[PDB]
Amino acid sequence: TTALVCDNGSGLVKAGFAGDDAPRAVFPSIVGRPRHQGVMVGMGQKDSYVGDEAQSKRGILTLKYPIEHGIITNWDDMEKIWHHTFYNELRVAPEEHPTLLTEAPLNPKANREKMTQIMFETFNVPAMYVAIQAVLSLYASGRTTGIVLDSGDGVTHNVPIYEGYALPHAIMRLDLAGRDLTDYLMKILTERGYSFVTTAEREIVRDIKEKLCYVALDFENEMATAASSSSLEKSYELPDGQVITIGNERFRCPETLFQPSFIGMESAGIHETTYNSIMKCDIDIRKDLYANNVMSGGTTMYPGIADRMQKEITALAPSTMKIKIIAPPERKYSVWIGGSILASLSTFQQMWITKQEYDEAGPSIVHRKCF
Amino acid sequence: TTALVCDNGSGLVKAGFAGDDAPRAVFPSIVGRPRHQGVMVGMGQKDSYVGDEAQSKRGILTLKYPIEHGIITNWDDMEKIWHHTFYNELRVAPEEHPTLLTEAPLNPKANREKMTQIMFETFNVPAMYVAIQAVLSLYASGRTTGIVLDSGDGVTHNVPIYEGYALPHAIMRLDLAGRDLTDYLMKILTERGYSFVTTAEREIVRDIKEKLCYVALDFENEMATAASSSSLEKSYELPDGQVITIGNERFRCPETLFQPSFIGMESAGIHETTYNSIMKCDIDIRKDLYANNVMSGGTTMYPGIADRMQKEITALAPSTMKIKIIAPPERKYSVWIGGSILASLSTFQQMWITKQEYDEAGPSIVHRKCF
Amino acid sequence: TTALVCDNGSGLVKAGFAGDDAPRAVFPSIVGRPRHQGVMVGMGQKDSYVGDEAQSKRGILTLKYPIEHGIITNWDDMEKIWHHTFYNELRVAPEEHPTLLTEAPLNPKANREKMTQIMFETFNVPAMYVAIQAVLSLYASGRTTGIVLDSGDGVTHNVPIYEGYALPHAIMRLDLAGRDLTDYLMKILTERGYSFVTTAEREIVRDIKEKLCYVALDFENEMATAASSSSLEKSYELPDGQVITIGNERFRCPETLFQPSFIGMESAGIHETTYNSIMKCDIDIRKDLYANNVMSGGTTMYPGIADRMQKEITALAPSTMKIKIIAPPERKYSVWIGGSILASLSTFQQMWITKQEYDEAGPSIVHRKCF
Amino acid sequence: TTALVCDNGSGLVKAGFAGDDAPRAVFPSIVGRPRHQGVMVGMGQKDSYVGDEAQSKRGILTLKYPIEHGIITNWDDMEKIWHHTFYNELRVAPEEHPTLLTEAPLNPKANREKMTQIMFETFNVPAMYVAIQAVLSLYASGRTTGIVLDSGDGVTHNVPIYEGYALPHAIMRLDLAGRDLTDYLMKILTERGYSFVTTAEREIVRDIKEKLCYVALDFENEMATAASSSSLEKSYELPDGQVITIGNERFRCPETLFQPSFIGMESAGIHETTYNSIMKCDIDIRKDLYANNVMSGGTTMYPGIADRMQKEITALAPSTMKIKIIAPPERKYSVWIGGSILASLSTFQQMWITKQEYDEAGPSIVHRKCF
Amino acid sequence: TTALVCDNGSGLVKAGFAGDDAPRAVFPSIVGRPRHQGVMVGMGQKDSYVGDEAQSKRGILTLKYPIEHGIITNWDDMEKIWHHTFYNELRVAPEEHPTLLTEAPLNPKANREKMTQIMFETFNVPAMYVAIQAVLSLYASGRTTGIVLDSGDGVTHNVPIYEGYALPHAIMRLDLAGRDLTDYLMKILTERGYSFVTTAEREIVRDIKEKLCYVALDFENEMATAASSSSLEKSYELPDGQVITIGNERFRCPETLFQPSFIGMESAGIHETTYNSIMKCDIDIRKDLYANNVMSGGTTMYPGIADRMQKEITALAPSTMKIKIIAPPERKYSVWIGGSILASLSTFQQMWITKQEYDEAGPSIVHRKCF
Amino acid sequence: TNLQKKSFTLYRADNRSFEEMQSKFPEGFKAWTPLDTKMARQFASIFIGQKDTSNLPKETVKNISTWGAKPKLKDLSNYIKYTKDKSTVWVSTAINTEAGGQSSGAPLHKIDMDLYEFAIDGQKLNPLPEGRTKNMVPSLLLDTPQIETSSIIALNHGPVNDASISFLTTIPLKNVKPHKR
Ligand SMILES: NC(=O)c1cccnc1
Ligand SMILES: [Mg+2]
Ligand SMILES: [Mg+2]
Ligand SMILES: [Mg+2]
C-alpha cells in the first residue's frame, strides 16, 4: 500500500518509500560500457555497468549521462537505470505500488508521454502520477505563499507561488549549472597546467570542486589580496598521490553564478533574474516576496552564497525594504523529503491515475493534470 | 581428451600432460652436429644430435640455437626438436590429443602462421591452441590485478593487466636477455685472462653464472668494499680440474639489468621502463598496480633481485604510496604451470580450433583470434 | 525650405519629405554595442552600431531598444539614432527646414519637453510643429466622424473623433503589443521543444511570427480540428539551416489579443475596450461610428482580423446596426502618409513654432497648442 | 630598426625579418650530447650539438626535445637553441630590434613569464610583443571571418573568429599530434617485423612517414582491397641500404586522426571536434563559419586530407548548407608569414612593449594584454 | 727532450725517436740459450743471445719468446730484452726520455700493472704514456672515421672508431695469427715429406712463407688448376744447399684465414668477424664505416689480399653499398709511424704520467685512465 | 570412519571499517546478492548432481549452464576468482595479509573457524586428515560431516602459501574481531 517516490536528476537519482525521512538509495546516474576486449577466460563480463560499479571500474570505462539539462536522449539506458534501481537497490517488485515521478517546471510533452507509456507497460504499476519539482521542494517549509529558486545539475528555474497559486507568466529559466562550472574549472586548472581530459578525469574535478571551493564576499578585494598573500592557497592529493595547489580559482569559480559573461552565457546573474521575475509580479506582492525567498539544490550547497545574494539584492535595492533568505540545511535531500511527505497525503489517493483510466483516456489526460 | 602442453623457450623446453603440476621433461633447446669425421667403423652414428645428446658429446660438437629473442630462424632444425619431443620423451602420438603452444606478446604475424600450418599438416593433430605468455603467467599467481614482469632467456617485456582487460598500448618490449649477460660475462673473465670462445666454451660459463652470481644492494659501496675485503672472493673448478677465481665480477653482472649503459644498451633499466609503463596508464589505475606486481622467468631467479627493484621504484617514488613485490618460489616453472590449469578448463572446448575448421578457413583466421 | 517628417516607433523609424507617398528610409529602431574584446589589429571598430548594420552583425552583439511603449529611456542614444537618420539615411542637413514630431496619444509631458529642447538646441531648426498620430491617421480617409485603431510594436490605442472635435475623455490606450505576442510565441515554441533564448533568436522569432502565423475565426473549433489534422502545419528553416515545424501555434498566437488572461495580463480584450470607448458617446454618434470604423498598423496585417473584430463586436451587439472596417493596403505607411499630406497644407504656417518664439516662451507654449 | 619574427615549434623553429616572405632559416629543434668517452687526442670535442650538426652526428648521440606539447622542460637547452639561432642563423645582434614571439592558444602562464624575463635580461632587446598563432595564420588569407584549424608537431587546437572578435569559450585543444602518429607507426612496423628502437631510428621513422604515407578516401574499401592486392605495396631504402616494404600501414596511419580509439586516445577525431566547436557557437554565425574554413600546419600537408574532412563534416550534415575548405599552398610557412605581415603594419608601434616599461611594471603587464 | 717510442711484439720490436719516419731498430723478438756444451776454453760464452746475434748462433741454440699473443710470461727476461734495447740497440740512455707503449685492444690488467711498476722502479723515467695500436694505426691516414684491421704474428683484432668516439662494445679480438699458418705449412710439407722440426727450421718456414707464398682469389679454382699444372711450382734453395719446390702449398696457407675450419679452429675467418662487428654497430654509422676501412700488419703484406677481402665482404653483401679498403704501401711500419707522429703532438704533455704521480697513486691510475 | 576438525585463521581487508561495519551490520559480512542458505545448499549439491532445478539469480544460472560436464569444481573456482562486480554471491578471504586488493589503508579483520575438509573425485567427498593442500587441486570445506547442515560452505584454492578461501554463507560478527593492520 506504500506508494513509491522516485526522482529524476541530472546528477543524482533518489528513490523512496512513503514514511521514510531519508532516501533509501542515492547513486550517480551514470551508465558505462567497456573500452577493451577482455582476455581472461571465464571472466563472465557484463554488457554494461551502472551506478557505483562504474565508479569502481572507472579507468577501463567510458561514461554517459542519459540526461541533458532536462532533456533525455537515450531511453533504454534510462530504463536500465530504473531496472537496476528497483531490483538491486530496493529489492521490491514494481507492481506492488503506484509510482511518483518528477519533472522540471517547463519541459516538452514528449518526455512525459514516454515516461507514462513505459511505466505502465514495462513495470505493470497500478497507477502513476507526475509532479512539479518546485512545489515538492516548497513543501519542505510549507509556506502557503512562496517564491522558489532551484538550481540543479542541469537547470535553474523560477516559480513564485502565492496562496497556493503559481504564476505562469513569472516562469523564468536559466540553463546554468554544475556542468558549466566543471568546464570552467577545467580551463582554470589548465591555467596552472595540470592535464585533465576525458570523463574519468572529469569526476575527479567534480570531487575537488565539492571539497575545496568557496564563494568570495567581494571578488575584487579578495583577488587583490590573493595576489599578495599565499594564505588563500590550498593543496590537495589525487588518487595518484600527485599533488595540486590552487589560488584565485577557488573563488573564481562561484563568481560565474554572479557573472555569466565569464562563460559567455548572457542571461543575467542569478540575483538579477530573481529580481526581474519579482518585477513581473503585481506591485503589491513584491514586498511580500522580498520578505521570504527559498533556495534548493546542489549548487546552493556552497558556503556563503546566500550572503553574497543578500548583499547583491540589497545593493540592487528594489526598494528601501528588508531582505531575507531561506536557505535551510540538508537542502539537497529536501526535494526528495518533500516528495515523501506529499506522497503520504490522502488526496493523492484521488490523484493516482490508474492504468485502466490511462487506457480509457489515452496519455493526454496525464499532461492535463497541470502545466 | 587429455591435452598436452609443450613449450618454446629460448633456453629450455618443458613437456607436460594436462592436469600435471610438474613437467615430465626439461632439456636444452639446442641442435648439434659433430665437428670432426669420426673413424671407428660401424659406430653407427646419427646425422645429428639434439637436446641432452649435446651435453655428452659437447667437445666434438657445434651448436645452434633455433630461437632468437622472439623469433624462430631455422624451421627445419626447429622442427627437429618437436619431432624429438613426442617420440622419445613422451612416447605419445600427436593426433591422439590436443596440443598447447605459447608466444611472446608482440611478434610478426608470419611466425604464428607457420606454427599453425605445420601443426595441422605435419603432425595431423586434432587441435591446437596459441596463447600469450605474459597472460599465462598471471594464472599462476591468480590475482584479479597485477602488472606482469617477464624476463626470459631471450626477451624482456611488460604487460599490465587490470580486472581481466589488457591495455595494448601500455605493452613494452626490451631486447635485453640472458644471452647478452653471458656475452658480457665473457669479457669480464677476459680481464683475468682465460680464453673462452665458441659456443661449447660459452655454455660452461653459464653454469658459473647461474650458481655463483648475485645482486648488489648498492653497486658503489659494495664494489668499494670488495676491493678492500677478500671475503667476497670465490674460487671454482672446471671439468678439466683447472680452477678459477672471481672477485668484483660476481656482482658486476646483475648491475647490467639496472644500467644498460655499462653494455651500451640504451633502452632504460628495467625499473625505469616498468615505471614508464605504469605512467603510460590512466591516472586512476596507477595506485592499484603498485599494490600487486609479478615477476617470472629464469633471469629473475638470481638472489636479491627483488630487493634492488623495490629501492628503484621507491627512488622514482611515483608517490607516497605503498609498493610491494610478489616473488614466489618455482618462478621459472610458473609459465608452464599456468598452461596446465587452462587446458583443464571447460570453456576451452569452445576455443579449440579444429583441423576441419582450419581447413575450411585457411590460416588467416588463426591470427585474428587475438593479437 | 522643404520640411522634414519624422516618426517614432519602438520598432521602425520613418523619415519623410512633404509630398512623397512612400518614406525614403525605414529601418529597425535598434542600437547595439560590442560584447567582445576584438583581436585583429587595425579593425577600426566603432563604439556602437545602429539599424541594419546591427542586424547584419546581430550575433556578435547585445541589443537595446531605446523606446518603450511611448517613453524614451536613453536620450543620448536616441539622439544618436536621429543623428544617423539625418546624416546617413536622409543626407539632408536639419537646420534647413522646419520639423514635425510625433507622440502617442497619452504620454508624460517630459517626452515633448525633451524633444523640443533637444531639437532646438542641437539642430538649430527655423520653426517646429508637433502632431498627434490619431489625428494624422484619421486624415488618411478624411471622414468627418471617425474612431481609429492603430497597433504597433509597443502600444495599441483607439480614438473617436466627430466632425473635427475631439472628445478628450474617449481616448483609450492599451499597452498590449507585438512584444507580448513574441513572449507567448516563445513559450509555445518551448512546448514543442526547440530552444530559443537571447535577442538574436528573438529577432528570428519576430520574422517567423510575421510569415507563418494567422488568425482563427473561432478558437475552439480551430483547435479541435488542428488537434486531429496535420494539414494545418507548415515548416520553415532558420538562417542556421536548422528546420522547424509548427502546429496549433499558428492560430494560437493571434488569439492572445482577444484573451489577455492567457498571458496573465488582466485588462480586457481589445475589442471590448474599443466598444467601451464608444459607449461614452451619444447613441447617434455611437451609431455613426458603428457604421464605419477604421483600423491601421502592423497588427492589422494579420489575415482575417476584420472578420474576428466584426463578429466579436457584433456579438457584443451595441445595437442591431451595421458595422464596418476600412483597412486599405499600405496601411502601415499611412501614419506617415497622412503626416505628409497634412504637412503640405497652407494652414500649417500658423502651427510652426519658431525657435525664436521657443526661446522667448520656453517649452510650455509648445505644450499649450494641444494636449 | 627591422624587428624580428621568431617561431617556436616542437619540430621546427623559424626566424624572420619583417618584410621577408620566406623564413631565412628553419631547423629541427634538437639538442644532443655525447654518449661515449671519446678517444682521439686533440679532437677538441664540444659539449653539445644543435640542429643540422646534431643530424650529421646523429648515430653517436642521444636526443632531447626541449618542448612538450606547449611546455618547456629544460630552459638552458632551449636558451642554447635561441643563442645559436641569433648568432649563427641570422648573424644579427639581438639588441638591434624589437621582437615578436608566438604561443599556442592555451598554455600555462610560466612560459610567457620566462620568455619575457629571459629575452629582456639576456638579449637586452628594446621592446617585445607576444602573439597568438591562430590569428597570425588567419592573416595569411586576410578573410575577416574565419574558423581555423591547426595541428603541429605537438598540439591540435581550434579557434573560430568572426569579424575580428575571438570567442574565448569556443577554443578547443586536442593533444593528438605527429609524435603519437610516429609511435603508432613504430608499433605497426614492428608488426611487419623490422627493428626500430632508440631516437636515432625514430628520426628515420619520421622521414618514412613523411614520404610514403597518405590518407584513405574510404578506410574499409581501401583495407579490403589491400588485403587482396600486392600492387599497393611500396618500397623504400634506409641509410643502411637495407630496404623496406609497406602495405596496409600506408592508409592505416592517418586514420588515427579520425579514430583516436585506435591508439586509445579518447577525445574524438578532429572533425567531430571541429563540428562541436561550431555547434558551440551562436545560431547565426554557424552558417557563415560553414561558409569559410582554414587549415594550417605540417599535419595538413598529407595528400587527400581535405577531401575526407569535407565529406565527413558534410556527413554530419548540420544542414543542407554549403561547406568549403581553404587549403592554400605554402601552408606550413603561413604561421610565420602572417607574423611577418603583421609585423609590417604601422599599428604595432603602439603594441611594442618596451624593456623599460617591463622593468617599471614588472611582468604582469605583458600578460594582462591577453591570455 | 726527444722522447722514446718502444713497441712490444711477439715477432718484432721497434724503437723510435719522435720525428723519424723509419724505425731506428728492428730485430727478431727472440731469446736463445745454448743446447750444447761448447768446447773452447776461456771463450767466455754468454748466458744468451738476442736478435740477429741469436740468429747468428741459431744452430747451437734453443729458443723462447717471452710473450704470448699479448701476454708476457717472464718478466725478468723481458726486462733483459728492454735492457739490451736501451743500452745496445739505440745507444741512448733510457732515463733521458718519457716513453710510449702499445697494447692489443683487450688484455689482462696485469700487463699494464707490471710494465708500469717495472719501468718506473727499474729505469726511473720521468713520465709515461701508453697507447692502443688501433688508434695509432688510424693516425697513419688521420681520417676521422675508421674501422681498423691488424693481424700480426700472435693476434688479430678489429676496432671501429667514428669521429673520435670509441664503441667499447663493438671491440672484437681473435687470436689467429701467422704462427698458426706456420704450423699448417709445416704439416703439409710433412705430407710431402721434407723434414722440418725445431725452431731453426721454423725460422726457415717463416722465410719461405715470406718469399714464396701468395693469396688465391678462389681456393677451388686454384686447386683445380694447380692439380693439373706444375707451372705454379716455384723453387728455392736452403742454407744447406738442399733445394725446395712448392705446389698447392703456395696458395693453401693464406686461404686458411678465410676458413679456420681447415685447422679445426671455429671462430670465423677474420673478415667474417669484421663484418659481425659492423653489424654490431649502430644502424646509422654502418654506411659510413663501409665508406672507410683500414688494413695493417704483416698478414696484410700478402699479394692480392685486398681483392679477396673485397670479394668476401661483397659476397656477404651487407647491402648494395660502397665498400672500400685503404691498403697503403709501407704498411708494416705504419703502426710505428703513427706512434711517432702522435708522439710529436703538444697535447701529450697532458698525457705523460709522471713517476711522481705513479708513486703517489700507485699503478691503478695507469689502468684507470682508459681501457 | 573418523571425525576430526581443524581450525583456520583468516583476514579480510575492507572499506567497512570495523566500528562502522559493526554499527551498520548487526549481521556481519555478506555478499551483495546473497542466496538463501537453502539455495546455497542446493547450489553446493549440484556439484554432486541432482541439477534438475534452478532457483537462483539468472547470471549464475548462465555460469552453471556453461559448465555442463561433471567436474564443476574447477570452473567454479576460476569463475569466483576472476568475476568481481556486485553480481558475485560470495565473500573472499586471505590468509597472509597479502590480499590482492586495496590491501592498504584498509583495516584488517580476523576470523576463526573450525571445519571439515574434503577433496572430491566428482562423485564423493573423501576424508583428508592429511590436508593435501599443496597439490593445486581445489579443496572444499564443510561445517559438518555431510552437506545437509549447510551453515557454512567454503572452499580453498590457490597455492599452498598464497591461499584463498571464499564463502557462500554469512560470516557474522560472532566469528569476527578487529585485527592488527
Ligand atoms: N579485502 C580482502 O581481504 C580480500 C581477500 C581476497 C579477495 N578479495 C578481497
Ligand atoms: Mg507604431
Ligand atoms: Mg607549429
Ligand atoms: Mg704485431
Numbering used by the authors:
A (entry chain B), B (entry chain D), C (entry chain A), D (entry chain C), E (entry chain E): 5 to 375
F (entry chain F): 102 to 282
From the paper:
Tc toxins deliver toxic enzymes into host cells by a unique injection mechanism. One of these enzymes is the actin ADP-ribosyltransferase TccC3, whose activity leads to the clustering of the cellular cytoskeleton and ultimately cell death. Here, we show that TccC3 HVR modifies only actin filaments (F-actin) and not monomeric actin (G-actin) as previously proposed. We present the structures of the TccC3 HVR enzyme in the apo-state, in complex with F-actin, as well as the structure of ADP-ribosylated F-actin, thereby providing three structural snapshots of TcHVR activity.
We chose to mutate E265 to serine, since an equivalent mutation in iota toxin (E380S) was shown to inhibit enzymatic activity. Indeed, enzymatic activity was drastically reduced and complex formation with F-actin was significantly enhanced for this variant. Using this variant, we then performed single-particle cryo-EM analyses and obtained a 3D reconstruction of the complex at an average resolution of 3.8 Å that allowed us to build an atomic model of the involved proteins. The TcART binds with two helices of the three-helix-bundle (α2-α4) like the skids of a helicopter to a surface formed by two consecutive actin subunits. In addition, loops extending from the β-sheet roll interact with the upper actin subunit. These interfaces, that are mostly stabilized by electrostatic interactions and salt bridges, lock the position of the enzyme on the filament and place the catalytic site of the ART close to T148 of actin. A key residue of TcART within the F-actin interface is Y183, which wedges into a hydrophobic pocket constituted by two adjacent actin subunits. Interestingly, we observed two additional densities in the nucleotide-binding pocket of TcART: one of elongated shape starting from T148 of actin and continuing to the middle of the toxin, and the other one, of spherical shape, in proximity of A114 of the ART. We attributed these densities to ADP-ribose and nicotinamide, respectively. Adenosine of the ADP-ribose interacts with the side chains of R117 and W133, and the phosphates are coordinated by R113 and K185. The nicotinamide is kept in place by hydrogen bonds with the backbone of A114. Our structure of TcART-F-actin demonstrates that the engineered mutation E265S stabilizes the enzyme in the post-reaction state, in which F-actin is ADP-ribosylated.
